[PDB]
Amino acid sequence: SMLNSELNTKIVNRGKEFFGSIPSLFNKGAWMGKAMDWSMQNEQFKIQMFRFVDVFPSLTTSKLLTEHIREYFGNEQDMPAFVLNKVLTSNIEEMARQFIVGETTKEAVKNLEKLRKDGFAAVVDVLGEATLSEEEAEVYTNTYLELLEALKKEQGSWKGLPGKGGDPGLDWGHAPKVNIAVKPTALFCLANPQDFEGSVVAILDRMRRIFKKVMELNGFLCIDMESYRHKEIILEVFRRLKLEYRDYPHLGIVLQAYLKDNDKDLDDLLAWAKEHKVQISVRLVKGAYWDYETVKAKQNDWEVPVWTIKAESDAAYERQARKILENHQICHFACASHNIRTISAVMEMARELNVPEDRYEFQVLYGMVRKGILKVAGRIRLYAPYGNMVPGMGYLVRRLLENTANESFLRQSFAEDAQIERLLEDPAVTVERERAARKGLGGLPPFNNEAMVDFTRADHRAAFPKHIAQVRTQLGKTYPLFINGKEVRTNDLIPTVNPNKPSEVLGQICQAGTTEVGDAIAAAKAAFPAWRDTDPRTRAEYLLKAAQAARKRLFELSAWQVLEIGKQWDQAYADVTEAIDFLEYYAREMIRLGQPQRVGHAPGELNHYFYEPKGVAAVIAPWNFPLAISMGMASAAIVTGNCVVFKPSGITSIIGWHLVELFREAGLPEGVFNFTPGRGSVMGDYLVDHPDISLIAFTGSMETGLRIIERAAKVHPGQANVKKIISEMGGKNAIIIDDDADLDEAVPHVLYSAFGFQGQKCSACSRVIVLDAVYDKFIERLVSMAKATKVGPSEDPANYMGAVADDKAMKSIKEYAEIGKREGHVLYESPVPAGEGYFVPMTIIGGIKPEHRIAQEEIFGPVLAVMRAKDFDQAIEWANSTQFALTGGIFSRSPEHLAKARREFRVGNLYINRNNTGALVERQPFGGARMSGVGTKAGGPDYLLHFMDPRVVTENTMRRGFAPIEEDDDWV
Amino acid sequence: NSELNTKIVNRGKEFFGSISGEKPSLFNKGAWMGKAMDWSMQNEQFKIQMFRFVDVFPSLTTSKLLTEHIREYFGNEQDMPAFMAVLNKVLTSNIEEMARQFIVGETTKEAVKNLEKLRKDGFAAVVDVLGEATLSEEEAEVYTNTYLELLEALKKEQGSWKGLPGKGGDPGLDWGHAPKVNIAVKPTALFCLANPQDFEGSVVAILDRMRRIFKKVMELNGFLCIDMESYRHKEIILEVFRRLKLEYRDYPHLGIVLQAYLKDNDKDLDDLLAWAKEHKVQISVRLVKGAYWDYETVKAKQNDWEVPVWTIKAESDAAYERQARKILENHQICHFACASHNIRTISAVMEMARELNVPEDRYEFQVLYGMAEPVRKGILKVAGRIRLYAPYGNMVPGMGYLVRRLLENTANESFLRQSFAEDAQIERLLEDPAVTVERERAARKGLGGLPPFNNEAMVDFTRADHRAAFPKHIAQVRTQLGKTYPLFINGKEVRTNDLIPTVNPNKPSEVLGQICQAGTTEVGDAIAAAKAAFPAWRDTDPRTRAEYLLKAAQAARKRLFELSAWQVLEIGKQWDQAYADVTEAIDFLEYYAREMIRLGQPQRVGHAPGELNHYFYEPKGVAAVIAPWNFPLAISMGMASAAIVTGNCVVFKPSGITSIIGWHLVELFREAGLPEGVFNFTPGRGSVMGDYLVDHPDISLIAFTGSMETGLRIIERAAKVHPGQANVKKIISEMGGKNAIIIDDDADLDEAVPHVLYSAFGFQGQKCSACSRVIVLDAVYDKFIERLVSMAKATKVGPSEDPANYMGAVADDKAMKSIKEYAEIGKREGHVLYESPVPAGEGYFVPMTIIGGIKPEHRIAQEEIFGPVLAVMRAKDFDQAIEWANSTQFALTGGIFSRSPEHLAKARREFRVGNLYINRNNTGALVERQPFGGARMSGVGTKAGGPDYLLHFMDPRVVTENTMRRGFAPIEEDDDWV
């Protein structure tokens, strides 16, 4: 504290030596500076300009360029002041080139030597589009090998940068002259902590190949740190490679000070190095993915992994830099910051702790007043990317964002002309100041979606194998009907087996005959009057209890689905959380809708409008979302005051039994929920036709749904109501890939949309409609990514997709595949495992047109039709050419085309620039019309009303010429 | 006027001084009534409970009723205030004592005895007969004869009465000038169907009885005052007075009441004085402020009429002083009775009269017997000439009169309350109310530029212009008869050669025109036109679509009486029924326009950053609209305009017999400039094109209102998805009802009876909401049906263009034959109670018919007849009443008259109809106030006129956008952020 004030005074003074000894982006004479100036003045313009730079390299024709310019910036008149094609192209390309050292290896190597003669060391990084295949990972890997080979032939002629002593052939007498950095996920297109070991090994195998070449020339390899999703994978890759070459000192890892985890990660890493008696090198950065991590975490209800006050990152940096410097004997340090306070702190801290100069250096990005830094510090290394202008454009966008952020130390230092005292402030003080400077109903928290499984966590990774094993000790049970609170066995048993291993029998399911169905309907009807008269808030409370019951069994409930229906780990967990979401959301919806509301405002009169349940609801559930959709339909019916007779799909009957367990744990009154699995040919029509049924909730095939709708319309003798239908049926969903689509995003999202859970989703992409000029490029990357994926048992997280639901689904899907192969041409058909299991290959077929059967009929399996549209008008026309309208997707960065799709691509759920599956409660209420449904949307604010009928009570309040005056009366 | 105002104030000060601090009994804290009023004034919940209890009290005729109501209104013994079966006794006795305080007797001989006591104490009297509402000719006769009996008793007594002492004049007269016998009569008690809709009939019926009473009054040289009732009858009552006055221009002792709280009163008073001068007669005016203040304000607000009363209390006071001065200035033509308990008012009158030197025989003072006691005695001491208003008769109307007195005394603005409960400052109490007005006057939301929704003003037959408009517009319609009406498809007229005439149900020989029928070809053409028009209409901005409805609404509004007259002739709507039909259509247009504007903006859903979800609605396509004849403009416009504003295009089939009304949709939408093909008009034979229209693959939605049989058929057929059919067809359906009104033991029969009569027989009972079953509790059954049947007997059946008829012919020949057969069925099941005469000659007349002895197992307790046939069902207890109400397959509307909080609660919960009405008729639902529709066999749970309705015509869509590019996303206002 007393000492703290003294050192801070030394840091501040050093800060001014840098300011005394002291960019293009803030120079308002150049076109770039004027564009950034207006960007920092106008946020609307900033958004347009940055998005334009992002899409710019896809603007490959005069038409694409001209139209996008108009669409982002308006006409040549309403634009800002600062031939539109020529002025923008040359400038943007000029801005991009300022940050790269070359587009070829020979140019980069030539430029690197010029840098050396100016006294700058370098670390070289290879620019590239995201790796989406093995071939792309190999190209990336070979580029480093090629670079290293070039440098190998040159470095012998390089004099070492001048130092105070040591080896005049080494930089500053100690640093290796060749220094490269590699992006780990660029070495493996399927890097994913869900398959942690597989990812580590695949990345590590390529990294080792590069490292060996690096060691051959006694160079340095730094392993870059990417997004939080891959942080643990990356640390483990570094740890393994280090120990494989425990004696080689020139291996480095990046750590990010903006991570709450980093204090611990750095402590652990230092302890690990000590334990193994190795040395390490750390490049400490603040972090490149701030906005992305914040958004990502908030989208999945995860804890935000980054500090959210900017000074907290600065304070963390100075704190973690001190820790490394304290540990200089084992940990070499690279300070990687452009912040003069941060740099000045590191310099005085190294002085305070008497750290030798060969234990720390300073690094900055090429293109971002370097000389002034080099004069005070002396040991400066430029981060020097080289490669293609396409990824160079995306890199530029990053630099523009970085330099023009409100919290950017650079923007504050120039563009704002800030007080130097505030700039060189101890960020710990800033932190405390910033911290100092800083709705549900009925007493319940507001709704929030349940947190998604998070495989960055060791415990979540370990949980699945544990619970799959625990579920396996519980196999072989016989499951009874559940009627009026009693278990009811019958003599008709149907086995439920593992679709990935059909010899594994999970249990036996009793089947309800018509007598048993009639009993359950009778039970539901008898329970109805009391349940109807139960207060809506009380009914909602059972759903809340069921939700907690489920939340407590999350991994166990997931594991059942992995085995019974072949859900992948993530897919299984998402099914359970969606069930939880329905329970939480429908509970709140009933509370909201449960209070009678006064309508009209005439005095002497009270009108109250409110809702009543219908009676007995038949709920006929699908197997593809066996807990989520079952629970959603059933809980909606129940919470609105109806009583339910529930028929799970046969092959997911055990998941259906989970509803019994959950409502039982919640203490739901007897007969409000009854469980009657049964054979459709025996009791399907009976259930639908029955006169005591007032409502039918169905999700499944169009054919079955349409039949139900037809039969339910009949009013039989003794039937009290016209039957209400709540039906969600299938889709034939298209994703459109526009000319300007970002293919790094489009390809994996399309792959997931088509083959996630074997394509067994009503929302699945079964048609990808690709614009003529981007067709060949798109399919090549899509097929190459597909080839990298593996088909097999869903319990093994290394597999992308596995077996389809059952034998019948397999035969039907395979027939469709053959039909499609006669209509189009096969682009990819995966291997499948030998032996048992209902495996259908991951299948992609091109040459498909709207007249083809597989362009029209829902296959409900891993068969993707690729269709080539001649222009955007045809793409939309083709998207709209089926009898379905459930979901749709479009990858496009054209405001005009997006506007057209929003208007004309009329599906129930249209997605823009992301996959078209995985709808979430409240955020994406799900459902459509045409042959896809009856316009009901589960998980939305209109849904509960479908399960009820409105009532009005009107009271004349006037007696003997007087009436009470009510609040909202129109009076005098 | 400073000098006079100072004399008035000093006069008021002497008045208060001479009162000596005495409180009227109602403000006596030492008395039970005072304690009850004190607590009522401190606690509004109690006031409401206590006053409603006093209102229901005379119906609590058994010990169980009494005990239960006491518990339901006041809670258990330890829930009650201190000043409150033994409980049954102290309560009953105190309430009865309170009521007796305001009444001079129960029998004529008792009233007479007590009048003599009053004279001994120096008070004159005006006698008025207490009675329940007159609901029949028999009841009007009993009321009339009560006065005749009273007059005969007073004729024998008056000769022996010494005249009250005065300063001069005739020693045989009161104060030397006033006749000793003075009675007041309530005009509407003389005619149960008094209604300005039948203005001439109402005046004559009332005048004829008033004349009989008046001749007897004149026979003993007495005074008759005609009381003034609610605003609805004010013009009728004025006309009755004027005519009776002119019949006996030479008889001086005839008075009329005028009400200072009416904005009309300055003009009315002026007109009456001018009229009196013109005819060279004299008059007498009792000026009051007015008895019906809350009622008039509520009634006007409920009908979007201008409130006829001032709404700042001091305005009524200021009006009184102004109008009293005018009368006094005109003392030569106008005798004055100051009727007020307000000391400022009284003082004002006294000083103005002195300032104008008005002879004392030209003005007297009047107060209500049994209240404002010290004011009464103060008037006696200072003015000398004071007349007590003296009600007499049965305790049942005696209790309703008491409730009114309690209300009058305990009002926040009551002079009596402020003087005697609140200890208000004398200077404030006595200030010029004109000053009060200025000080109160100075001390005193829609969306998107549009004013909020309000229901169109109902036709108001208190106005001479509204009364005169109908015969005029009917005559004008008659010049338009004989046209041929074609189909209207894609903006063009299409003629077919199959023509069906449309005629006047009350005079079938009158042919209103000929209607072209669409075959399947033309219906297919209309569907093709709607479908071609759909894409551009769908893409039209919702606000722009709403604007077309707003223009149609204005077009309708400017043609209101015209459109109304067409309905009177084509389908036999009564004047009010016709107008209400057109206003309801206007309401739909205004309401659905606003609803589309509300629903037309996409809403962000969720709050995750980097993501925008917008939820919004899209139309379905071509809507078939199949409309009924019974609300030929209203329901048609409602269903069609809802489909239109939500972005669908409409193929519209009106009912045959109301096709011309259907053509009004063409006129209105074309006047609004609606794009071609958005609305198509295709009347046709159901047996030719009905199924075709419903079966058609390009239909996506069907809106139907009508019979259960047709509705269910449509539902079944529409469920099928045919080749080329784009959507699962959406059904919006309003079907029949078999609606019951329950009459509980404690029901107020004065309200229940006329409300049941209207619910059952308004528009000949041709409403889905109509009461067709009245379920009456055992103990009140005989009295209820006697009054109901007797009221029915007074009504006339005949042509709806004649406003004197209650109801007229039914829709057409088929309806007449169907209903008549049901009546015969019902007469074999139960027992006929009433079967009205009907006119001789042409017309589809069915007698107004009432049948008792009906049980749930009977056909006419189950099947919708849709005509003037009412089943009366006798329930043994309230549980059975509810059970019987719920014993049909329908659940559309229902009613209950009851004043039991427990029974009303049971009804709210278990009487599960779409629209349940408490203490009023179960018909005439208004847009927004009563969204209309039911489930069971009455419908599919859609409610026209309410905020869930438009959604049934659309399907929701969500657009989800990932807004993140290259690691950055715009931050939006409602994002969950940091």
Ligand SMILES: *[C]/[C]=[C]/N1=C2[C]=C([C])C([C])=[C]C2=N([C][C]([O])[C]([O])[C]([O])[C]OP([O])(=O)OP([O])(=O)O[C][C]2O[C](N3[C]=NC4=C3N=[C]N=C4[N])[C]([O])[C]2[O])C2=C1C(=O)[N]C(=O)[N]2
């Ligand atoms: C059958 C009937 C009878 N009538 C009469 C008679 C006599 C002799 C007398 C005395 C009475 C009568 N009536 C009743 C009346 O009307 C009453 O009473 C009065 O009105 C009372 O008053 P006063 O007393 O002067 O007192 P106050 O407190 O002052 O006053 C009250 C009044 O006012 C008004 N309001 C209230 N509130 C308000 C008002 N206005 C405006 N605003 C507001 N907010 C009212 O009016 C009250 O009441 C009668 C008669 C006849 O015939 N008719 C009638 O109508 N009535």
